[PDB]
């Protein structure tokens, strides 16, 4: 006759049981509700059936799983084990997604800081080109050849960034080879006359015409000038052509590879 | 005579015991149920006996293990230790699977974004070819030679992506070598006449015919043109052939490697 | 006379003590039981005394350790510390085994997906050969030379996979060098006649006979054809031999390395 | 008639319920409050709508989520599971942001220590230039050519740092080649006379004029001097020119590549 | 006069105190016991005073530390902090030992699988030799030169494994160069006669005598044969010698590097 | 009329509330106190406004946050969630700082062990120079050229360390080339006479004068000697000069690159 | 008048308060005690003021921090937050120290196993030399040149280890070039006579004198012999010298680089 005497014990367990069932059913209707709601809000963005609908299904499963674990705890069964396995799974998936998340974070930083603007000619680790646009997970640029390149944001931020366009003026360099016999002063004079004649070069800024080094086959002269970024490339070509003409007119000779032979007959 | 006086203590322990046994048996029938259910739902997809049936067995073991740990906790024995070892195991397996999970996540991102479409000619880190299809864990493409290549999705997203097809028009480049003696202006005139004659080249877009650099053995001329992607390759060959013919007709001579010897007898 | 008055306190502690001893002894008999059971089931697979028997001993130790920790908790001594050290150890061993586990997981994926079948000629990062079989932790293939190679599954999945056999048809390429003096049209005609004569080449598919590039010592011709994978290698050799014969018959001359010397005496 | 008898139980549950609702509503008004406050304080710094407003929204969501979880715990539902999933997410995002955080920490260290000052000529792993400024996440410097380079702080601290400017004086080195026939002592005398004549060289500091090594084609002389950093470059050029002139005046001859032929006729 | 009225409170705290002291002393005697026991069992294996005795001391310290922490918890002082620091330390040491543990695990796998047997000629990433024995943490092999090499097990499993011995038969390859003038058919006939004469070659298996490629200086012939692994090396040498003799007898001439000069006087 | 009957319940909640408010206010005054104290102690070391004052502000925020979380727990709201997010943040920041902490730890080890002393000539992975000083996070050394280099402590400890200065005596090596025609014994005799004449060489220690190898163009002789570290460099130069003189006196001839031509006219 | 009625509540809180203060003060005296004790025991080993005294200070701070946290818990304030931040810090520092700990563990393994003894000539990844001693964190060896090298233990264990000394006997190899015209048999006979004459070579062990390969400029002969490790180097030199003499006596001629020219005049 312990039953009549333990009515209170029965009350305690019965309220817990009905509360657990109530939790199950309320969580079920809550899950239905949340599932329809998430779709209602998800349709706004572009939506792919094979993936986007799938992820809403994932959410449904996650909610019912949480409510179920909670219910099992309500019943009075230790859920620490299921919590542990769940946490291991979550950690693993987070590790897997770390890579993509890094690209996302980089992209955000690059967007707010703006190291390079759109439409600028830059290089991002050996790939010169003009940027077209920036995106969340990736960057898009066009090469000189015309090929399109896509590069992940996370990869570029780590590497060095070079922005030719940001600087208005840039410097040029020429190297020239001539024979040993030829006079130094004559060549220097000619080169000075040439560079002086040009107009797209900045007089105020430095100009260098000296003998940098002595090659084995021939001596080498170095020339340095400064010009606007836009006209740089044209300047190079024009100067080079003028040099070729002027040297042949002057009498200087360009050097071929040089060989000296000691020559005996056996 | 403590027994009669501690009837309530006995009640407390007895209810816990029978509840633990009930948990064991209900978990057993639940595990049988879940095992048959998972197979019922698993048969839909392609199923390999050596692996797929094995994983259902794994699920059976996992469920019975969870229920068993819970039962041990119900008995009143500290289960924190078994929880700890279980969590270590789960973490380890998650780390092991991280690699494959990364490929999966990448594939998802690539699918939704579509950096490159199927049937496009692209390169994905030094392997040019045409894509055939995209998959969950991997990508499939065909090389020009005809070899098939498979590349994991996770590997390509990290690296740069190049999409030749995405751009309609592309640029070409030629390099040419000629002797120093030969006149600059004559060569330039000839090359201009050639490129002008062609019809598959875009007049509106830039055209470059200049002396880029001075080689040691010979001077070098650079030529740049723009044409449609489809006809690019043909254009290259036709232009090259026409150049060879035109130069020999003109009298210009192509250069062989050049050597100059100072020559003494011992 | 607190003892008589605190009989209940004594009861509480005494039941805990005897329950702890009971747990110890039941865990001992359980451990004996489990140890014999694991051997009974382990004998089925191949079993090495120096390792396999050792791991059963490990299991014995693990079970007795768990039961002992639980008993210490039953006595009323904080076991959180022993749990912590145990968890650190488990994490460390899991990290150590991560590498091998990765190979295992890869192997599973490769088995179910079947990127390459057994008996196919494939390359798996610079090692061409024919696969012999697939295994759990590793893959086995034979090289052309006849050497056997073993490669871990985890390593290959990361790298690119190339399956020559999967594709029925493949393409070939030849490169040829000839003197500048020689006529273009004559050579082209001869090469076309040759390739046309062959029967193992696919007429429907493309055929290319053009001047690809101008070498310094000599010009270069490129030839491309398509043929079945099986007969490809033979086709290459036969074509090459026929070419050698046909050129000497025609009067064309193959080029040696070319040198031009300006020659003065001192 | 358990209700009348369990008034106290009802009181207990009712106070918990109303307290949970109170927590929900107070947390709601708190969240509104915090959201407006964070904007009020955020406007001070530069603010981008697409990102900065977004992060305030994130904060709103985070606060309401915390309060909601707390409320669920107040109701009496186990929240350990939701805590676990939340912690996994937090760990993952922290891992993702680790990279950028590293750059930030580096930048801080570099700022306080000041290995290199602004406006100094330094190299930071193969990129010589002058620093312009230091920033939080990145560093900015200008190359000699005039190109701008941006380099992340985290990358440079790991690598070696070279500060030319920090040292007032620096050393120079010349290498010279001459024929075997030429006398050693004469050359040494000439070189000593040259270096002695210069004035921008530090007499007190060492000066080296010796035969370092015997090349195959010719012998090699090494020269070392010390000069101020500013005038170093000029000194090099002037010395080199003077050397060329002095040698031709002296009668020494510079060497061309040397070849010796044993010469037989077949 | 609260003392007389709170006798029970005093009892509660006093029993806890004496139990804590009892735990301390029992743990002390337990630690002495365990320390002597571990030595008793440790002497069996080889034992180094500077390290092995040290590790027994470590065990003593660990046990007393655990018992001490437990005692502090018994007193009623929160030990969660000491647990936390202890767990951090354990995690760190586990990370440090991960490397060695990996080698151990690899060694186990290699032992049970036996990719390569002892006394076999194998290469394990560019180090050819004969294995001598396998060990727990490392592998031992001898090179052809006679040098001894030790390689850690963990390093080799990651890399490719090549087992020459496992395969009974292997293939050989020869490359040969001859002048352009020389007849193709004559050379082919001679080579066929040679290989046919040999007896250590497998007739049933393939034999290849064809013109593989056209070198610039000379044409190249390829020869392939199959022979037993043991006699392979000898076969190579004998064949090569016979070839040299046969060619000079036949009248064919081996080629020297070939140069062609266009030769003008200035 | 439950209020009058539940006075005790009201007491319980009221004491908790006032205690929570007391905790808030005491923590506030404690935070003010700690903030002023930390500055008082921080001024001793060099202090940067933009960073050092900022970190004191950080401490203020941290303390108020801890006290606030504690207060929320006092109120009776589950704080496990806020604890979880806080722990994730702490883990992330610790990971970020791991890099710098590694440099710090290395520096400590290097300081106490002293592998290389200050003012010694050492190389630390391809950067030879003299150390100037050691610091906490980095090391400073000067190169021979005079450039200053800074290298992080963590990077050098991993790599090999070479200490020229630690060893008093060092060895030298010379290589010499001579013509085939020249007698072996004569050359050996001459070289022995030379090295014997020198005084800065250690007679007791080994001396080697032998023919090491046969070059294609010429034979090579190797010479090895031992001398004090300080005088090593001078010894090299003096020996080399003496050798040049002695050979020309003896009649031996140094070799130029050697070519042999078979020479036919077409 | 709740105070008089709640005397017991007051007792409960008052005992907790005084116990907390007692814990604070006992922990303070305990910390003083431990601080002096640790110094007393620390003086035995070499002790640096800037670091070693600092670490004792660290210990003082750690103990007072633990006792303080415990006290805060005794007061009744949730300390889980402070525990969490502390654990994050500990994890971070452990990660930082992981590197050095790895070197320590390696060193231990190497010490007990003894792969290489002290005073042996070994190479440890491209650095040949003689070991001098082994240490805890690092290894010390001397190079042949006389330079001292220090290498961390953790780095070497990962890489291959080569122990020349462990093996008593070693093998040698010579390569020789001769003209095509020269007879094979004569050369073989001469070489056999030479090697047979020597006495420091092991007759029982193999001896190889064969034509290994056909070079373009000349044919190549390979010779292999076995000798004791100590006398190996001397044997090489003596054999080489004898070979040079014997060939010139025999009439064989060593080959120079060979060139063949087809020679036409334009």
Numbering used by the authors:
A (entry chain F), B (entry chain G), C (entry chain A), D (entry chain E), E (entry chain B), F (entry chain D), ...: 15 to 280
Please quote the paper that reports this structure.
In prokaryotes, MscL and MscS are the foundational members of two structurally distinct classes of MS channels. Sensitive to tension changes in the plane of the bilayer, they play a key role in the response to osmotic challenges and remain a de facto standard in the search for the molecular principles underlying membrane force transduction. The E. coli MscS crystal structure in detergent revealed a homoheptamer with three TM segments (TM1, TM2 and TM3a/b) and a large cytoplasmic C-terminal domain cradling a water-filled internal cavity. Independently, we have solved the nanodisc-reconstituted MscS (MscS-ND) by single particle cryo-electron microscopy (cryoEM) under a variety of lipid compositions and protein constructs as well as a DDM detergent structure.
What is the EM structure of MscS in DDM and what is its micelle placement? However, the structure of the N-terminal domain has partially unraveled (red arrow), suggesting a rationale for why this region is unresolved under crystallographic conditions or in nanodiscs in the absence of the N-terminal 6xHis. We believe the pore and hook lipids were carried over from the cell membrane during purification and reconstitution, as we find evidence of similarly placed density in our DDM MscS map.
